[PDB]
Amino acid sequence: TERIRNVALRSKVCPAETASELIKHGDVVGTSGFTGAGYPKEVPKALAQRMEAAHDRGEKYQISLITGASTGPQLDGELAKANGVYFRSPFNTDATMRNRINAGETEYFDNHLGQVAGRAVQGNYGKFNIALVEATAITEDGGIVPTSSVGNSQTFLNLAEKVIIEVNEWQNPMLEGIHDIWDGNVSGVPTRDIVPIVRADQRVGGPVLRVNPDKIAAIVRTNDRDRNAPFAAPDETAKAIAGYLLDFFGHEVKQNRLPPSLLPLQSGVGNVANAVLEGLKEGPFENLVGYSAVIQDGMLAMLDSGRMRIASASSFSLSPEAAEEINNRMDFFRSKIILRQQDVSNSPGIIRRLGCIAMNGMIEADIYGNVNSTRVMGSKMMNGIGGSGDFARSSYLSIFLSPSTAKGGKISAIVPMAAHVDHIMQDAQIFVTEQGLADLRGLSPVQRAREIISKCAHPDYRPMLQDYFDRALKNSFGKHTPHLLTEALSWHQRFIDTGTMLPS
Template sequence: MSGAPTDADALDGRLHGDLPVTDAGSAAAIVADDATVLTSGFGSVGYPKLVPLALADSDRDLSLTLVSSGNVGEEIDVSLVESGAVARRSTYQSSSVARAATNDREVAFTDRNASAIGDEVQYGGMVDPDVAVVEAVAVGEDWFVPSTSLGATPAFVEAADELIVEVNRAQPLGLAALHDVHRPDAPPDRGPIPLSGPGDRIGTAHVAFDPGKLVAVVETDRPDSTYTFRDPTDDDLAIAANLGTFLAAEMERSPAFEDAVHLQFGVGSLGNALMGELMDLEFGGRDVVYFGELIQDGLLDMLDAGRLECASATSLALTAEGQERLFADVERYAEDVVLRPADVSNHAGLIDRFGVVGVNSAIEVDVYGNVNSTHVGGTRMINGVGGSADYNRNSLVTVCALPSTLKGGEVSRVVPMTFHVDHTEHDVDVFVTEQGVADVRGRSPVECAQLIIEQCAHPDVRPDLRAYLRDAREGGGHIPHDVKRAAEWDG
């Protein structure tokens, strides 16, 4: 590896060696009209910016297949999508423009869980990759140091024929200290991931690549988009309090939580609020460890307060303030914060090994414990399944936390039957709303329904849900449903 940084702290300078530095327009011209383009980016950060904008601004008749492993910023999911250049897209998106294009079926969208996308692209036959376009803080002839997220970037770089690197001077070189790049070998001779704990490092600060792939390096100083979170609502705080009560009892229950508890929280304002509330929870001397997908501001608070041992994730989903705080002190945070590829941060086997308590939200849940986290009314995509499927399936204890209503209480998020299922009745252990906690472990479907209705649904909607369950039970069966009536539900 020619000049790759062996000590991330000693990295100086952005460009190393003899590189094909060019402008964004020239780099974009390398991308074929119907190319399959794999981009870095996860949690709306660490994605390439200038090359997508140059593609959007070109007058070519583009029909791209664009794959990112998580959500990216507006340069891709607004400008490039609006230009009509994207024919096919995967996976996860978070802009209203990309959402509309998906729901209008102008873009053919496919959605896979975050841990799977690297392998699906590289080995699984999902696409036939042409070029990877990635953001870096520094690049050499056969290595680059990623910026604010990792996602499936290492797999994408291995899978693509060509590589374009955007070196972003708005991202501090110090980010190198956060990365732990470990890409598992190809199956079937793939060894176990040799990680003994979420804070361990088993890889490098850089992504290595075949130097023959590097076709362009573009320089930029265009910053990432950052997150904005609303202040916690009363519902958020009540959910957090209910979750805290559950967690306190759960830690006493299982020997798996005797010395330490490993947590994961889904992204969003609720997730951020839940992380914030952890500050007040009594952990009884246990080590608190975060093994999740995204670093949110609340985790920095916990680290600063000495209440968190370490945090492992694949992306920095921070507010502008949180990003400034981390950037200003990145070496210190790097002692306890590790960014990993998504196929490590979200790996089923690791979530299992660490006995994670996974807490994720949803659009709606049905009384039998099926969870819809992607499609309103079963038809209209919101964002994508992301990593929620990884944690909901593989966590030792799986919690679905959500407000019991939306639209100011007009619409119940607890429904008789959800018409899109992202997480099945086999997966989630505990439901938490501002109303209470339904622990459905070991319960039959009808018992589960009774618990969810009485503990989690809003009191205003409980009579209707009880009536549905009562009448459906007359129809018989292990999971009694009246589908026609469920289809007419407007609670």
């Protein structure tokens, strides 16, 4: 049945390839798409091809690409291969785009996800020339129904001089109604409105994105899927991590420091956080509620088992099989899910009010519990800070999760000093690895070190960390946060030099 239910707009429909021609070299382009969900697919390809052709002719042809968060092969992948992006923000997971960024070929800045809208309205990315937005359907009165995410779409629509919509047969029409778009000033000119959310499951807006139909210069019909990586089935490492955390939650509850149903749950991107949710789907906490940035396979599983009643996020970010699953059971899941603008899902004011429990993965932490979420060896981008800072700093409890080692044991995820810092000590209270859990609340840096080294570090690396700390305590310039600057980053350099942090 017709997805474009507004007759007047049908006159604007055209091939993906024609739409792409609206985008000019130098253009700032805002797109839908949040962590592998709901990004535009067909127009990006056409632009990519046109870009390569122009480049061979010696014609400059690159855009600035601002999104909700990560997209997919069809967008980041295609444009990266074409060398078509001079600037990218705020979050990426595509290997080709990542390579461009790590080669200095595409400039990249990973803003806090909840701040992107406000900075765009402030003009930090320049003037938006194009909004390219994927839709489930266009309503009779011209509402744009989003797809598997909301992201920054409403903001990009407001800002852009011209709008291109992609309407996607693949997205299940029962998506219509799952979204909550608030028409208030969240990220506009101060003073901003109060967003009156006081419960994680509370709706305060409507089902559609609003745009002046006059700004719509093109509409493209599509039938393509959100392409995400599957999640790793929880192995012994992941299960141990879940085990420690569930016990921790259990002891908090027994001590009356958490309610039996805990607090609204945020769970970050990646395999480790996902694995913890798989643990929760059969855990001893009932009537859970999610207030997250993304809903991964594990969270969907919790909704499925009924251990979680409802989940708020800006997107569901699912494996191919789970995305197939939810599209086949959209009737069941649509009442369990609320998709919000990312500046609302990731609003520090709301997160703190609700008392969210934040659970996020990490590259590494140093012995003082500073956290790197992003930059391997301090210089090589993995994905980006994403919403981890939005949640870590605002949450009732901030929890970081990681195997105690990486690359088959050749890297320690607990190091003397993080090569890059995304989350300072103040923003991290709990660390969990397969070795144990460190509870850092109320502790000084030296006290944090003792907990982190003794609980979380891998036995292959523990003595070396203890050695570093003991000698730092003796020799450091100051003793408040003891360091030996000649060797603080030496494990990372050892890896670079030899392929392993383990000495020979």
